[PDB]
Swiss-Prot record:
A protein binds at G132, K163, D239, Y279, W334, W335, N336, D341, N369. PANTHER family: O-GLCNACASE (PTHR13170), PROTEIN O-GLCNACASE (PTHR13170:SF16). It catalyses: 3-O-(N-acetyl-beta-D-glucosaminyl)-L-seryl-[protein] + H2O = N-acetyl-D-glucosamine + L-seryl-[protein]; 3-O-(N-acetyl-beta-D-glucosaminyl)-L-threonyl-[protein] + H2O = L-threonyl-[protein] + N-acetyl-D-glucosamine. InterPro entries: BT_4395-like_hel (IPR049478), Glyco_hydro_b (IPR013780), Glycoside_hydrolase_SF (IPR017853), Glycosyl_Hydrolase_84 (IPR051822), Hex-like_dom2 (IPR029018), HEX_bac_N (IPR015882), O-GlcNAcase_BT_4395-like (IPR048162), O-GlcNAcase_cat (IPR011496). GO terms for molecular function: [protein]-3-O-(N-acetyl-D-glucosaminyl)-L-serine/L-threonine O-N-acetyl-alpha-D-glucosaminase activity; beta-N-acetylglucosaminidase activity; identical protein binding. Residues 125-392 form the GH84 domain. This is O-GlcNAcase BT_4395. Homodimer. Optimum pH is 6.0. Keywords: Glycosidase, Hydrolase, Signal. It comes from Bacteroides thetaiotaomicron (strain ATCC 29148 / DSM 2079 / JCM 5827 / CCUG 10774 / NCTC 10582 / VPI-5482 / E50). Belongs to the glycosyl hydrolase 84 family. Can hydrolyze the glycosidic link of O-GlcNAcylated proteins. Can use p-nitrophenyl-beta-GlcNAc and 4-methylumbelliferone-GlcNAc as substrates (in vitro).
Amino acid sequence: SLQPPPQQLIVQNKTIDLPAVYQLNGGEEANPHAVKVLKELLSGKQSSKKGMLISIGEKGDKSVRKYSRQIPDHKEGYYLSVNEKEIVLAGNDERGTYYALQTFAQLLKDGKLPEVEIKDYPSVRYRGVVEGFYGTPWSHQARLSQLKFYGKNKMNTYIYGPKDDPYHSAPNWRLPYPDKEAAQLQELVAVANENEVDFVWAIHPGQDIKWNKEDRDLLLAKFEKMYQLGVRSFAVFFDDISGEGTNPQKQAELLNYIDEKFAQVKPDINQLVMCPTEYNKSWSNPNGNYLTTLGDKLNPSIQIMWTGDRVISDITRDGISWINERIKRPAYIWWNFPVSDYVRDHLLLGPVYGNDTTIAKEMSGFVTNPMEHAESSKIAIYSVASYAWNPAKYDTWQTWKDAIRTILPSAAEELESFAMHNSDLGPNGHGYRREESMDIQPAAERFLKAFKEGKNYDKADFETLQYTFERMKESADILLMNTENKPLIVEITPWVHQFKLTAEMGEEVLKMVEGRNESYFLRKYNHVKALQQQMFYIDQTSNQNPCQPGVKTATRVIKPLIDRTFATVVKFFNQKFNAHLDATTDYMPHKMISNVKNLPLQVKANRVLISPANEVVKWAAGNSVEIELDAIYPGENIQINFEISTDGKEWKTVDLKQKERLSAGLQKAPVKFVRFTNVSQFVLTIEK
Ligand SMILES: *CCC(=O)Nc1nc(OCC)c2ccccc2n1
Ligand SMILES: CCNC1=N[C@@H]2[C@@H](O)[C@H](O)[C@@H](CO)O[C@@H]2S1
Ligand SMILES: [Ca+2]
């Protein structure tokens, strides 16, 4: 299906052959980036004075004079027509002609075109991506590929602002990029121009900015150096900072100075954008004038960014009305999905949904903050492009599938099968969740309800679970060997391994449920235990980032089903045969006995810890919490917030410091046991 869907479309159910012999009118006067696409689509066909007429141009060109009343009078609009006698590709402006050609390219199938007439233009003026996350910035190659992808989906905006780029942010925002990075940025700009994308270079100076002449001038000089590299759009971000940089008068004055002294002196600057310090409703001070001050003081052509009612949120009619009244202009949305920089152990490959589809006139722009996995983010980015171009016709589910089919034609079903179970974020501090595994959830819930209570589970439900696990393994194995988009596969691989293991575990657990004899059960139980260990090894060796290390997959429905089923069936087996099989679901090589306590230990990088508790705690009469590691290690430190040994019996005390935060270095002392008993979090850090 055409993506994004045109504003107006009339199809005739004739079809016509892309002309073998054609006559091209407007090649020397239309957008050269449009003419280039057209000639690629027409190579091997004969350009000659006789034959089918193709007319390409912008309003004002000689080539499309006949069609000027058909051309929408909208920025980035176009008119496209195909019939028996002629083809017309006509923009309101140069970018419109390029976009005509991106629609044309999707219409052409097996050298044939439908007889069609289209009038199209975007509902939202600025549409795109802000690489504005924390973590590993996108590679240069990833970015080249992104920019072509934006062009094909009529996204006109790429805002460059990776938080970990030292020349964008703290500390080196005052310095020009080194030669190597500068030549790369220059190449990005050329490629963005060829795909009709505005490269917006942002700067994040607010953590140590001084409100003086010197820093003002250095900021302009940096902007000037970026102008030399080809940049024609600019932004200044004041997000996630404290101190003097948060002053709204000074922010507005700086932005206004940049406008008057730089954006108004150059012949050719397009966007000028700021992001505020209070960038969502729940974070704006009620007893405060931060947003009204920006609203009143900031020059009216300067955009202001906004994430919604919370840091992570979907955009509502009431929410956008709320911010527009204060900032006095339509908000430029920074939408925090599929960004995963706060749940880095998850991929977010689900559909794009939750945003009101009737508020196009209430937003200046709409951009998505994506994951650090660039190719993976294309599912959401394609969807956002469709949303923001034509929100009234926005179909979440269909666009999700179209995206998957574009990104991985050779294995789209397998990719969809993986993504359906890799959508949710798990629990997080922002409270933001997404649907996952919704097709199997019914059967999952019934099966488990029965099985726990005492009744027979429905056999179709059991088979649906089997079906699922089988299909999961097919998709994992096919995906891992796919070479049509190697960069995608490299990104998702650790999660593909973990997903396969989840599926294998699921199958073995269902064979425990069918429970032929005693020794079959035990073989299956041992196989599960080994798969649990394998999952632990992936979780400790893959994606070892400093925030949320490891790899979690199918967490919403599938892993809890499997874990709860295993626990249940192991309990029934213990009851039946008077045995003592361990029913725990996650492999943990360290042990933790106590009197108080059913908190599972966790391993994160070189940290061994107890899971933070809830039921506030009963502790008296020499009661102890003993942790035994699986070997002796050099101890770095311990940290606790409301004794050691290698031996078991031979103990030495440690004295904790105090800041409300108890903590003591162990200066590489050998440690295997750690014990605590009543006096005056819980994290041992070791050398790995
Ligand atoms: C481990 C996180 C990282 O790479 N850096 C970082 N992250 C965050 O939040 C990530 C969600 C952050 C917030 C405020 C200030 C600095 C920060 N640094
Ligand atoms: C104008 C909004 N700016 C924001 N800055 C931060 C981003 O860099 C993070 O990626 C995001 C989610 O962790 O949270 C905030 S939203
Ligand atoms: Ca022209």
